[PDB]
Amino acid sequence: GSGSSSPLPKVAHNLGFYFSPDLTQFAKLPVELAPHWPVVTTQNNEKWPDRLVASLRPIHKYSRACIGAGYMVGPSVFLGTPGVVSYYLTKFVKGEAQLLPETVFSTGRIEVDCREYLDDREREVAASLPHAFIGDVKGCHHVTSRYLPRVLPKESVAVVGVALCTLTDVYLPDLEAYLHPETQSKCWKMMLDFKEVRLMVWRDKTAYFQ
């Protein structure tokens, strides 16, 4: 085939997949060894009983649509498009597909140094929550933060979903429900790129990942 969209490495790493016979963003594995080790791949090869398959279309009932996720096609990073499936993930363990958990996704903006809003809806959420992810601590920045300098030394930045700061590019409308407190200050447990993270939201709508 011509190739498929595929996860940013963090997504597969957080699911416990590090090697690939075919995907350049992961550690190379000889294809001869893929039958005997878990691999992330775009080839739904039944000879590889432990595999995380990324595909353009579903391949099984348990295929997970990864919507608005950053992704890669060959060497190139693409930004998530809100409401559009970036890729499907199907996890096989000993030949059997497994139900994957729900999660929100990083958008790929960090990887390509994009500081722009994905759409007007995101812009409006930011405007309504001016103390969410702008380095306020009682720091954590969204890629769209008004206080992020143009030149960030990458070496010293901690990425949320895995320091100088912590950095996130989550589509803000996926977090909006969390960012207005029901009653009190709250520390949410949530899944981002299949990794458990903590989102701290103070009564004054100051918010950051821990």
- Write out the catalytic residue numbers: 131, 141
At closest approach, how far in Å is the CB of 164 from a copy of itself? 4
∠ at Cα 177 (180, 71), nearest 5°? 130
Residue 130 binds to a copy of itself (criterion: CB under 8 A): no
Q: Which of residues 95-124 bind a copy of itself (CB under 8 A)?
A: 102, 104
Q: Shortest gap between Cβ of 86 and a copy of itself (angstroms)?
A: 14
Please tell me whether residue 3 binds Cl ion under the rule CB under 5 A.
Answer: no
3-state secondary structure the chain: CCCCCEECHHHHHHCCCCEECCCCCCEECCHHHHHHCCEEECCCCCCCCCEEEEECCCCCCCCEEEECCCEEECCEEECCCCCCEEEEEEEEECCEEECCCCCECCCCCCCCCCCCCCCHHHHHHHHHCCCECECCCCCEEECCCCCCCCCCCHHHEEECCCCCEEEECCCHHHCHHHHCCCCCCEEEEEEECCEEEEEEECCCCCEEEC
Q: Which is nearer to Cl ion, 16 or 139 (CB)?
A: 139
C-beta closer to a copy of itself: residue 4 or 103: 103
Name which of residues 104 to 163 contact Cl ion (CB under 5 A): 139
- Residue 33: phi and psi, rounded to 5, are -100, -10
Q: Which is nearer to Cl ion, 90 or 206 (CB)?
A: 206
The window from 12-20, 71-79, 93-101, 180-188 that contacts a copy of itself (CB under 8 A) reads 180-188
Count other C-beta atoms under 10 Å from residue 138's C-beta. Answer: 8
Sign of CA dihedral 100, 114, 55, 92: negative
For a copy of itself, which residue of 144, 180, 193, 194 counts as binding (CB under 8 A)?
Answer: 180
Between 26 and 87, CB nearer to a copy of itself: 87
Give me the least distance between CB of 139 and a copy of itself, in Å please. Answer: 11
CB of 198 to a copy of itself, least distance (A): 5
Shortest distance in whole angstroms from residue 150 CB to a copy of itself: 20
Residues that bind a copy of itself (CB under 8 A): 67, 83, 102, 104, 159, 163-166, 173-174, 176-178, 180-187, 198, 200-202, 208, 210
Residues that bind Cl ion (CB under 5 A): 139, 206
